[PDB]
Design an enzyme around this catalytic site. Structure first.
Site, mmCIF file in Angstrom:
data_model
loop_
_atom_site.group_PDB
_atom_site.id
_atom_site.type_symbol
_atom_site.label_atom_id
_atom_site.label_comp_id
_atom_site.label_asym_id
_atom_site.label_seq_id
_atom_site.Cartn_x
_atom_site.Cartn_y
_atom_site.Cartn_z
ATOM 1 N N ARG A 61 -0.312 44.751 84.147
ATOM 2 C CA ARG A 61 0.144 44.811 82.758
ATOM 3 C C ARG A 61 0.901 43.556 82.330
ATOM 4 O O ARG A 61 0.824 43.159 81.178
ATOM 5 C CB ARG A 61 0.965 46.077 82.478
ATOM 6 C CG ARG A 61 2.314 46.193 83.169
ATOM 7 C CD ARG A 61 2.855 47.603 82.960
ATOM 8 N NE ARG A 61 4.108 47.919 83.663
ATOM 9 C CZ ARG A 61 4.201 48.384 84.913
ATOM 10 N NH1 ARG A 61 3.120 48.571 85.666
ATOM 11 N NH2 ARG A 61 5.396 48.668 85.421
ATOM 12 N N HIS A 183 8.637 42.088 82.779
ATOM 13 C CA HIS A 183 8.958 43.451 82.360
ATOM 14 C C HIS A 183 10.400 43.486 81.856
ATOM 15 O O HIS A 183 11.183 42.578 82.136
ATOM 16 C CB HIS A 183 8.786 44.422 83.541
ATOM 17 C CG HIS A 183 7.480 44.285 84.268
ATOM 18 N ND1 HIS A 183 6.402 45.109 84.026
ATOM 19 C CD2 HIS A 183 7.086 43.430 85.243
ATOM 20 C CE1 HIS A 183 5.399 44.762 84.814
ATOM 21 N NE2 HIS A 183 5.787 43.748 85.564
#
Lengths: 230, 231, 230, 230
Positions: A61, A183
């Site tokens: 991701r 993140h």
């Protein structure tokens, strides 16, 4: 002397939609999450930001966000370095579990402590657990006792720091233009050191998804200022 | 018996392949068909259970995007991708950007034929004032300018690839890393020429298909045992 | 924008005194040879030359020269990168033989051609010979077919130049101060490229032992000038 | 599977003869400390110990140990990787002062605490003090925040561990033969992790100078046993 550093948090994943704790689980971006990385890439292109290196996690991701940025900005030749040290905070035995069933199993009070505190982690995985990162081939070259059974934000902050000091920061000092695509929690760990924040301050810090965060730094890497391209 | 597996892969159709324009180092994107070919290669590699520890590619997007689509479809996004000018397509010199009717008009169709099919006769040189010279492109700002070609024949491409084989690819293979090289017809022909010890004649006849994995089984000294296509 | 490059040729080996063909034979510096490197370091210290990286061969007579320079200039923290590509020209089956013995078994004029010519190498070793680099564990990570059975100066030029283009030159372009410490023929190969010399010119070029050769380069790495520190 | 790791503490520095606190002060080996290094080199060669890499600090007393060993073992081709992370424990404002002088100022029991405790450092340097590593060009590529004003053994342990996880351990797992040539306290940092020592055990641990410490490790890098080569 002014150096420019760009931080970027990845967009929505499929598990954000299904309301599950993710952590090191390697789930993909949703279509909207892909769309955010593309939009982030436009803003950087529109302001003519260039990069000599991109650092990201080993989680798809984040990696895919990095890829979509470079593609949209026409900087595909730029080397991409992927490291577990920029991984999302590990969520221990919560990984994979529905956020509601957990909140009714452990109670909403205990679940809140595990999400919002700085130094109280969720319960550990056993190494025999199939979710233990040591079983994942992604981490085969990493010494297995470096890998977490669980993490609090403090743990995440402490594992990001050596990568800051050993790779990102030396590159900045060598006059390379760096992007960090990672993140929320790993970026919060970077920001904590950059601005030398207290525990209280880092807990109140919320980094929005898909919005480039630009730091201007002096010769000693002290922040001159920071701002979002939006 | 110690065996090693190496996978070579040529990128699919670019946007300029339709227009019949000489590309060379021009950084044209894969067409949508080129995208899907890279995906199909990845799907098939996943089906036959291939894994990679490292991917080597050029600094041209059509090759890089091919590597990406393969890693993504194969669920191997964590694998490092190393990008090098030494795996770039053969430089086409002053032919770059022009179609066959433009080149025939400047040079005559017979000169152009020679340059297409020769081993050691390159097309006309760019010079430092031409905007197509790699020296003006910031992609190569950390490369010494006199390492960058004004033109290339296949012999040149073959010679610039060999160092990268000996310094980076071959040592990885000998350390039991599973390597994929995702590149261009002519740069791959440079690797194959060395691997199979091909003569000039044999390398000229060699036609590596686009988007079909080329698997080499090598012995302990990196001498090929066999090679085959997955298709 | 000017860059500074230093080249240094190692001092006298023990075999220079004995008058044997050396090549890749890994012979040590004579005591005098050690003194020459120490003096080279003093010269560089006096003019306050600093280095960010030192490049050398995997042969001890050159490695030890680099060590003595760094030690004398108080720069031991500087990284030293060793490569086979900077090795001396390989002397084939002549390695280990006396210069009079070769005159006997091959003729005097045939020997002079092997030494002074550009593209006529001496006789090959075969794979069965103990002197073949493939049997030496030093080159165990180098694919065996990249290693020479013999070399002419052309061969040496062509193995050096990829290391110039991939490692040395990019460091210079990164504003790193480089020293290359190596051998006569491998340095002559670097010079040949730097100054774009012809075959005739490079064959006349005589790089003296233990004297630092300073190149000033412009922004495109074209030499502005060169000189010796003495 | 098993692996073999070799640790080595440098010999006597010139300041050990003067009973002075050294820390990050880059003082040379004494003549005795050079001989120890050479003797260590003879022992390893005699027992046919080979190395693919040597890790050391950026302090010359360690670097010169590594060099004398490689030279005596005839392994000069082996890469040396130098890192500040393997530096000696920093001694704060005590660096440069002799041990008798320091007792008069602070008291002998308070000095013992700074020498022998796990988590209480000596008095910290000021940022404006000449001895602060941030003013030393050796660390120009290291962010200033990583550079200590003072250290306890705990600090040293925490800065060595990332280098273990990032560089030493991956090499061992990649079947490379590693030597770490460093300092008493930085090596204690490694040993603390290797043998999972308590704070009490590591404080009593005493690694002799110039004696190779061999560790045999299993597939997960857990030690099977360790011994000195004497």
């Amino acid at each position: 002397t002014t150096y420019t550093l760009v931080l970027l948090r990845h967009g929505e994943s499929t598990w954000n939609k299904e309301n599950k704790f993710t952590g090191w689980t390697d789930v993909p971006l949703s279509e909207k999450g892909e769309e955010e990385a593309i939009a982030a890439g436009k803003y950087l292109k529109e302001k003519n930001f260039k990069f000599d290196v991109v650092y990201t996690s080993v989680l798809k991701r984040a990696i895919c966000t990095a890829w979509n940025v470079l593609k949209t900005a026409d900087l595909l030749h730029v080397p991409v370095v992927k490291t577990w040290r920029l991984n999302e905070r590990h969520c221990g035995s919560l990984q994979g579990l529905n956020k509601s069933e957990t909140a009714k199993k452990y109670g909403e009070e205990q679940v809140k402590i595990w999400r919002r505190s700085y130094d109280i982690p969720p319960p550990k995985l056993d190494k025999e657990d199939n979710r233990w990162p040591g079983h994942n081939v992604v981490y085969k070259n990493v010494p297995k006792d470096a890998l977490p059974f669980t993490e609090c934000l403090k743990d995440t902050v402490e594992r990001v720091l050596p990568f800051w000091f050993d790779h990102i920061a030396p590159d900045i000092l060598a006059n390379k233009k760096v992007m960090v695509a990672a993140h929320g929690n790993s970026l919060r760990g970077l920001v904590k050191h950059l601005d030398n924040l207290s525990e209280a301050d880092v807990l109140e810090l919320n980094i929005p998804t898909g919005v480039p965060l630009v730091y201007e730094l002096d010769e000693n890497l002290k922040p001159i200022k920071h701002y979002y391209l939006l």
